[PDB]
């Protein structure tokens, strides 16, 4: 039996419900996988460091959890130095970082490919200082290369009247989801690209847009067997018992949490089937002495290949998803429909 850490945000209730359900689903008695949970403000490096350090101390073999742009270095540095694997649905780092298994697909290439698909050369880009500027750099770099006229307004700590005089007809929205609703209002013909992986995840449809065109992305495909099968269970769980459950949908970060559980579990079955044993903690020890079996755990995690709610799951040697599909979505009067996909080799594809 294998003890692991869990680092959840305090408001992340659906995702912890998806984690609990995954633990039951992906177990067999051949080893107990046993979670140690901490809840915390993931923006706070001091808190995250403490939590990582409590976990290392007890003897976690891997850690599931979260981070934001203020805590990403705490995690990647501590895990990298001490050789503890971290599996997460949080935003993926630009660079390579050993011991980090990124469940979340990169959105940039699909975003960029979609802009080229619609043949947009003028467009406004509304973005969010709270979430990080990683994607804004990619689009500004591509705009300089491809002589796009990108008008880039921060809406994350009116902008209405500046839109009119500059007069940008297309709009890309790379903001927190709560803000998306507010911004459509100011403007009430236009075109919207929602820059995230769960286009249908909360408010949408009758947001409303006044009959504008809306495009977006979905990593969770409710036409898949595994996903519709999963939702049949999820949709009938007791909500008092599983908060954020008993719904027709699941947020993408919650789906990646449940997928995480499968990857961790398969990595440890691989080590048993290959007869690689793992046994047996001070953050501030000097010099740093990484635990010796950590390399084997990392190698098993990146060698996992399974299907789950977010489609085919496979990692390269730096822990990034490869061979994924992102479905391209438009909002039809009927409903959110799939007009195609961006696949990890084939780029944008119609039908």
């Amino acid at each position: 039996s294998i003890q692991i850490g869990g680092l959840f945000p305090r408001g992340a209730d659906q995702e912890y419900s998806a984690f609990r359900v995954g633990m039951v689903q992906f177990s067999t008695s051949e080893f107990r996988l046993t979670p140690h949970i901490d809840n915390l403000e993931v923006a706070n490096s001091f808190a995250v460091t403490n939590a990582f350090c409590s976990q290392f101390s007890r003897g976690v073999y891997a850690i599931f959890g979260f981070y934001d742009k203020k805590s990403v270095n705490t995690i990647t540095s501590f895990c990298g130095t001490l050789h503890v694997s971290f599996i997460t649905p949080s935003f993926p780092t630009d660079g390579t970082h050993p011991f980090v298994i990124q469940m979340r697909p990169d959105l940039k290439g699909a975003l960029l490919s979609l802009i080229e698909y619609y043949q947009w050369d003028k467009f406004a880009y509304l973005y969010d200082s709270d979430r990080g500027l990683s994607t804004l750099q990619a689009v500004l770099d591509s705009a300089a290369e491809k002589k796009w006229q990108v008008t880039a307004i921060n809406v994350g700590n009116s902008l209405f009247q500046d839109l009119e005089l500059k007069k940008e007809r297309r709009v890309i929205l790379d903001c927190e989801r709560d803000k998306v609703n507010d911004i459509v209002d100011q403007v009430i013909g236009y075109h919207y690209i929602i820059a995230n992986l769960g286009f249908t995840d909360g408010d949408l449809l009758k947001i409303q847009f006044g009959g504008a065109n809306v495009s977006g992305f979905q990593i969770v495909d409710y036409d898949d067997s595994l996903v519709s099968k999963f939702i049949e269970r999820w949709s009938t769980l007791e909500e008092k018992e599983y908060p954020g459950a008993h719904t027709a949908t699941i947020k993408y970060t919650s789906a990646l949490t449940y997928d995480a559980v499968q990857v961790m579990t398969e990595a440890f079955r691989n080590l048993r089937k290959q007869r690689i044993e793992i046994s047996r903690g001070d953050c501030l020890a000097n010099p740093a002495v990484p635990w010796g079996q950590g390399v084997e755990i990392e190698r098993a995690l990146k060698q996992v290949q399974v299907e789950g709610l977010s489609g085919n799951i496979k990692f390269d040697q730096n822990g990034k998803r490869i061979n994924y599909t992102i479905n391209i979505m438009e909002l039809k009067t009927n409903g959110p429909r799939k007009i195609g996909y961006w696949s990890e080799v084939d780029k944008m594809v119609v039908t």
Binding site: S45, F46, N50, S77, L133, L140, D141
Partner: protein
């Protein structure tokens, strides 16, 4: 009040000269006759490549030795861990490193922003169409200021992040900007990358009449600009430390006589960061001085001194340390030194320098309240 006062020193890779300036400011304070006196006693870690693991070790080692404040440096990889532990534990950070715009409790940022200075200069020169060459090494504050002022005032900007560019990529890029008739540039990069771009500009032959470069750096004078002097491209920058004041001159009389083996880096004049570092020591001194005049016997007995202690045990007197730090107002090598409630430099000033055939000449200065006043 006690005879010694205990501080942290946390320095990173490539900071010989800064550490020189720190060691001197503490030596002269510890031996000054000048008229509640104390000796500053430092506890120093130089952590080479700066990353959160190494920065937490250094911090926790210094927190456990009884330091009341930490003079520290960081980069993008360690800034948040170091600010976050400091604000959690009520130990104040005095730092010459890059400023952040958000959102500082217990952190005292000696280095003023270049944002205001940079934007007023673009107004005066009436820049509409230009390239912004940058990196993310000091955050995104400049880039956002620029791309918002492009949107606000209808400009055109070619904004490229030059992080991870090899040397052909620069030539390749400068070739592609050649063909677009792109002549005007703002460059905002870490010093080693700046020097490289400046070499690449030269190779291409873009260092001549017609071409314009605004260099977002605080030490325009320390940039070796010989081929641009000759070539005749117009080049503009900033200079925080004004060498012709008698306070700087007095320091320079000492600095020139320092033994190069004791004080490496003293063979060249002080970079803006070295000058901030000495100013940091003068701010820590003024602050302990004023706490004693206020009649507060600060100590860290017998608080545990384990940084990972649960429950978290903040320093109770950290609040008064912080409040006094932020009210400090003294003169330093970087001119008048004071801050606002959020810890950022305020009522500061810096010279504007233009490159002419005689060499770099002061065409004005910029103050945060008065803005650009020319000559």
């Amino acid at each position: 009040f006690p005879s010694s006062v205990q501080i942290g020193g946390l320095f990173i890779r490539n900071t010989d000269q800064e550490y020189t300036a720190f060691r001197l400011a503490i030596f002269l304070h510890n031996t000054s006759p000048n008229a509640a006196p104390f000796n500053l006693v430092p506890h120093v870690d130089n952590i080479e490549t700066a990353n959160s693991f190494a920065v937490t070790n250094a911090f926790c080692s210094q927190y456990s030795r009884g330091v009341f404040a930490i003079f520290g440096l960081y980069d993008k990889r360690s800034v948040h861990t170091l600010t976050s532990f400091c604000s959690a534990l009520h130990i104040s950070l005095i730092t010459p490193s890059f400023p952040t715009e958000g959102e500082s409790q217990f952190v005292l940022q000696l280095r003023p922003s270049l944002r205001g200075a940079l934007l007023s200069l673009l107004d005066h020169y009436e820049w509409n169409c230009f390239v912004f060459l940058y990196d993310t090494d000091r955050g995104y504050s400049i880039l956002q200021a620029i791309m918002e002022k492009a949107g606000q005032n209808g400009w055109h900007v070619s904004a490229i992040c030059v992080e991870n560019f090899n040397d052909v990529s620069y030539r390749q890029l400068l070739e592609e900007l050649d063909r677009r008739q792109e002549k005007k540039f703002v460059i905002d990069c870490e010093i080693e990358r700046l020097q490289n771009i400046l070499e690449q500009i030269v190779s291409v032959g873009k260092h001549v009449k017609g071409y314009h470069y605004i260099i977002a750096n605080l030490g325009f004078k320390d940039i070796s600009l010989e081929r641009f002097i000759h070539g005749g491209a117009n080049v503009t920058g900033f200079q925080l430390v004004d060498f012709n004041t008698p306070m700087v001159t007095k320091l320079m009389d000492r600095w020139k006589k320092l033994d190069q083996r004791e004080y490496p880096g003293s063979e060249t004049p002080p970079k803006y960061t070295s000058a901030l570092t000495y100013d940091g020591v003068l701010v820590m001194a003024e602050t302990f001085r004023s706490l004693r005049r206020q009649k507060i016997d600060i100590s860290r007995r017998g608080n545990a001194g384990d940084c990972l202690a649960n429950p978290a045990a903040p320093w109770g007197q950290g609040i008064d340390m912080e409040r006094t730090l932020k009210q400090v107002r003294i003169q330093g090598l970087t001119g008048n030194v004071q801050f606002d409630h959020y810890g950022r430099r305020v009522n500061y000033t810096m010279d504007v320098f233009e490159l002419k055939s005689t060499g770099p000449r002061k065409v004005g200065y910029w103050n945060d309240m008065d803005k650009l006043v020319l000559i």
